[PDB]
Write a protein that binds this ligand. Structure first.
Ligand SMILES: [Zn+2]
Ligand SMILES: [Zn+2]
Ligand SMILES: [Zn+2]
Ligand SMILES: [Zn+2]
Ligand SMILES: [Zn+2]
Ligand SMILES: [Zn+2]
Lengths: 518, 514, 510, 48
């Protein structure tokens, strides 16, 4: 619980922003059938032209304002097209002779907008809100969206709008003001109303995840991170338990403990539990890789493209789990009991570190020969998975920035899911679809198993011959689940948004839909 | 014996060592071929060749004391199989007592004189016949010529290859008897127990090398040597940091600064009970993990995951202590040494550039923290020479360049004295652990001229590292016949993924024959 | 024999200097016994001191000029013998004539190494390079072998000679005061001959790849041959084809220059007691081919030297043709070609067929040297010789094993290896025996061809290459001197001509 | 042949064979000397 320091200027906690300006936005949904009042701030139309590639803008909604209706006549809109992500701003005086900002974002010519399409839309929309001072945004949907997509739009708008300034000091943005109201006009509004506060909770869970990932390793270490987890649980009324080193020793978690050996920070295993009142029908463990910094260890990340400067993100798995805990604790689903573990530690180079070649013993008795100290994630997960399984759970889903190979296989958009059970994997792909967090199913190729045969230990951590290292790492993890449906989502490739230089908070929504929709 | 420090309570605090191996339980019986072969229970294997005729037919020439077996093994049956080296076949038949017997052969090729590497091949074929077969007895019939040394080599290799190291197995049946039929059996009998000790010497070294670095660290390695000394009645001194500082071993101490394990310098001594006529110091590099230090092993092919093996020298030395302490050679005093430490990266580590003073007062400029073995050896050699021995022989996994010069099959021996070099080469022949004599080229010495220190640890121009390391080591032996055996290339068997325990037989043959 | 050109300004021959200033030096030897004169130019004393640092210089020889005052012990104590440290002074002598007088330090040891004598000569050459002198005389106040004296002379001439052929004065007299100067006189003309063989070899090596290419190299050797009256033959493509030299032809497929196989033969005056064939690697430029030398360390800029083996053979021919050893038939052979990247190049993966019928799977086109040597080695063997000795800048690995000073010799015959090691001793070109380790032979088992060119596992490249070559000598004693490491002088930026003397000494002694 | 459940279990041959010598060889007592570990093989020459 006390965070060690080397000098007194070392942070002793992760700064966390819970009441974000997004929380202060009053959101009202109205039915499009009754027309748009245009009286202040900015009114954006989401408009498409199904079929016509870059076809013209034509507003379909009744607008309850002579002047603004005039401005939006077809004649006046023809100079503009609907290319996905295109936008324009208009300035005019309404009937009340008040200055009024109106606009549109193009949603393209495919009537079925994909995750990535809606993301481009929200991105264009957020550029209209940055660098502007506005008290109210209203968005008019003149496109077809199902309920999940409408929610995803809101979650994404919120997330992308929010700016993380915890580490700015002399360079806080003088010019970040946030809207205070958000109006939404859509067909069958009443049916979309439910989605607003769900979006708001989903946004925070993901933003929360995002704040932990983005917190550098000198703020976010295994003690601060677990202290944050405890605080989160306390705010949500979750049972929690942080296992320290003496308990991890008693539990013989030697694989986990070896990874943290080199750290000035004691390993801390997060265990939070949410339990429904009433009948518990499903029991799920959600396991997040929580390496708070990954140097690689003695196999140091030294090679070009190893992105050591990014390795604060190696706890993204943990963060996703914890943002899930936020959503689950907030939405209080029925008939489930969820464990949200996290074998948190730091992978450092020290006199005390574990060394390539070390044979360590996992909590299930399996001896593992370490071939590369930068394959630490699977070691910590091995023990986390033994622990999960001993909880007598129906599903274990881990999520982990496990392998850079994910960038060569699926890249930056889609996470990969592996597992030992087709139904579980399909539930994950089912939640992938409803969270709009894209995952793709990848195989655990048993043929590669033999390459984890160690001469001296029960198993090798790494293949010295197979380069399909996301698969091998899955094979390894499979050895630590005896008899429970288990899946593994490898988010190494998708967790960090390279273009925007921040975390995606990837997983929270996926894990939440997974928990909710069971 | 010191306490092994731990970071976590799960950290092992000793090297597990198996002294009583299944090989020790094997009863070995040697029979002269002239009396004919009894072919009964177990598996009976003929070692057959056909000189001159490449892949020529199998002919079994020994008398077999069973009409059914003899019938099966007549030339007309056997000519359809060939002697290609390492080839093997199993036979099943009923002997004269209506009993099912398993017979076979291992082809030994078409060269009269099998080489160490050929014989390994034969042995490997033989061991695959022992694996996956619950046999109580193997009998092996020599129908090939071998001398005494090769015969012994056959048994050591058999024993060694047959034995499986399972100390580190958690979640994942040996023969009891071995018959050997060979001509002039009475002359070979004496190799049997010699082979048994050599096997264990090697196997013991191998257990230590294979022991991972969390198991086998300076404290637990030296503790293992103490224990070995106690079992064998050798004298022992383990020098710790305090005594090492007193001895001014700043080269050796520097390498270990960055480790959580205090340096421990192992000094085992075997003295003979009669008038001592030769004194010998055997010095092994003992780096229980070599991370490279600040010059971290990060480059492709640097093999940091194999670096537990950087104490192979020390292992060979200890395994030689085993063989010597067991065989009790006469008229000789042997000191077994090994400045043990671990080369780590830490706030406390020594740095590239550091200038450090050896126990002989020579200052050394460190060019590369990963050339640490020569520094620990420097002070070992100074220590060794202060013992006042006739010979100092070191054995070390010193230079990766060995893999580029002699490869993985022949270690390099350098020295300052030809007589001693020839004695090492002689020991190579008879131990059948192959060594090749490599030069200490004095022309490279100038590239060890340091602008600031007395000497550079490494050459900045000369890529011949093994030679340059040698040249460096030579600066630390003033007046004594000295040789240096670079086993970097040969210590670890890449195909079999295990250590060879290389050097143990070599060093033991050296001590015994001289 | 005409050299193809891309532009008219491409050289079409290798410039060679045969008549060097060094040939213009009149050499006389004198017994230190009779004391030393100081009539002219530069007089250097070679001095050491057992128990040094080095200690002071003390001259021991008596001098026939009251120069004697300079070299008295009060003034000489100010100077030390540290190896290669020198000083020289100008002054007037008993004639009021201008004399220059000095010393070179020879360390503490009274027996001197190949490499120390080098350091001695370099220091002496320094002095000659910056002084105009009609004469230099050298006084030996240190003991030296007949062989080492010669080596000193050879090294002096070679190090003193400068190669100016590509740039857009010397002493006319050398006097030497030794001791038993009768024992030595005879090393003089041998030295001079060995110097040229060496220097010549160095002219070929230093000749860039655009001057010295298979055709120019083959014309030069034919010209050399002509001057010595060696029998000569240059096999071109059509006869190399007839002869099915496919490994060799494959390597040159990529070059604009036709393969040229040099066969020079020195028939002997005597009774024919040993047919010997010297086979040099003649890659006039090695790009590496499709396995291009692109890796930091691969030294593409130096690969004009990859014919150093060939030059060493040729330079040896100079020495043999000149000194006229008796009872030996000698064949000077080199598969000359270029290793280039092209639409026409052989590729990684090609299965090529040597002239003995061995199919070879090319695993790396930069291992082209053993391929051409394979074909030459069969050709050599077909000659029915007693000894084959090849000499090649074959493997980068040499530098990691023996380095830049000693070359390694591998072989299939102990007594031949031994004749090479002893030539090493008396040539004072250091060579060390390295094993052909047969355990590694398996790594050459191709899955498709009869044999692999390279091993993919084993890193002991010099050893796998020897094992590869060994497959191409059936019945003849054979040794392979790998000079990759020793051939170029990296500190001095020039060929050593390594191997000429050693090969010559070899045919002279055995 | 396999041994379901028993990892590296003994070899047991069930087929009845038309030869009394091979029948003998294939008896359980002989075959249990061997195991079914994937890819592990043994084969013996005999007279029928
Ligand atoms: Zn890692
Ligand atoms: Zn990681
Ligand atoms: Zn090292
Ligand atoms: Zn080392
Ligand atoms: Zn090449
Ligand atoms: Zn080449």
């Amino acid at each position: 619980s006390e965070v060690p320091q080397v000098v007194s200027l070392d942070p002793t906690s992760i700064p966390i922003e819970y009441n974000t300006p997004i929380h202060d936005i009053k959101v009202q949904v109205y039915d499009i059938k009754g027309g748009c009042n245009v009286e202040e701030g900015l009114t954006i139309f989401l408009v498409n032209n199904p079929g016509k590639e870059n076809g013209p803008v034509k507003i379909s909604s009744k607008v309850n304002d002579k002047q603004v209706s005039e401005f939006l006549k077809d004649e006046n809109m023809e100079k503009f097209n609907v290319k996905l992500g295109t936008s324009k701003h208009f300035y005019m005086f309404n009937d009340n002779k008040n200055s009024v900002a109106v606009g549109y974002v193009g949603c393209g010519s495919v009537a079925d907008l994909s995750e990535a399409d809606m993301k481009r839309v929200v991105l264009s929309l957020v550029t209209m809100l940055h660098d502007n001072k506005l008290s109210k945004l209203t968005v008019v949907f003149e496109i077809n969206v199902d309920k999940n997509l409408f929610r995803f739009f809101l979650e994404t708008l919120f997330y992308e709008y929010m700016t993380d300034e915890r580490f700015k000091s002399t360079d806080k943005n003088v010019n970040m003001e946030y809207i205070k109201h958000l109006g939404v006009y859509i067909n069958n509004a009443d049916t979309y109303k439910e989605e607003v506060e769900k979006a708001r909770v989903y946004y925070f869970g993901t933003y929360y995840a995002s704040q932990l990932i983005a917190a550098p390793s000198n703020y976010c270490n295994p003690v601060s991170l677990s202290n944050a987890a405890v605080e989160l649980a306390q705010k949500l009324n979750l049972e929690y338990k942080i296992l320290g080193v003496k308990e991890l020793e008693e539990l013989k978690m030697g694989a986990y403990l070896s990874v943290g050996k080199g750290s000035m920070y004691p390993n801390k295993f997060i265990h939070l539990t949410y339990k429904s009142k009433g009948d518990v029908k499903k029991k799920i463990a959600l396991v997040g890789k929580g390496i708070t910094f990954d140097s690689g260890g003695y196999n140091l990340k030294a090679a070009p493209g190893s992105m050591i400067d990014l390795m604060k993100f190696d706890m993204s798995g943990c963060a996703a789990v914890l943002g899930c805990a936020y959503c689950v604790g907030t939405l209080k689903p029925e008939n489930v009991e969820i464990h949200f573990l996290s074998a948190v530690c730091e992978n450092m180079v020290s006199k005390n570190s574990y060394r390539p070649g070390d044979i360590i013993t996992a909590s299930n008795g399996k001896t593992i020969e370490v071939g590369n100290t930068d394959a630490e994630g699977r070691l910590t997960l091995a023990d986390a998975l033994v622990y999960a399984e001993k909880l007598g759970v129906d599903y274990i889903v881990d999520i982990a920035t496990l392998t850079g190979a994910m960038l060569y296989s699926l890249g930056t958009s889609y996470a990969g899911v592996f597992g030992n059970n087709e139904e579980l994997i399909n539930k994950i792909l089912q939640s992938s679809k409803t969270s709009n967090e894209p995952v793709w199913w990848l195989p655990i190729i048993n043929e590669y198993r033999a390459t984890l045969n160690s001469k001296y230990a029960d198993i090798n951590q790494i293949s010295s011959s197979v380069k399909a290292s996301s698969i091998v790492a899955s094979l390894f993890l499979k050895e630590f689940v005896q008899n429970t449906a288990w899946a593994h989502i490898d988010i190494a490739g998708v967790s960090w948004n390279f273009k925007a230089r921040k975390p995606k908070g990837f997983g929270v929504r996926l894990l939440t839909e997974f928990v909710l929709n069971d």
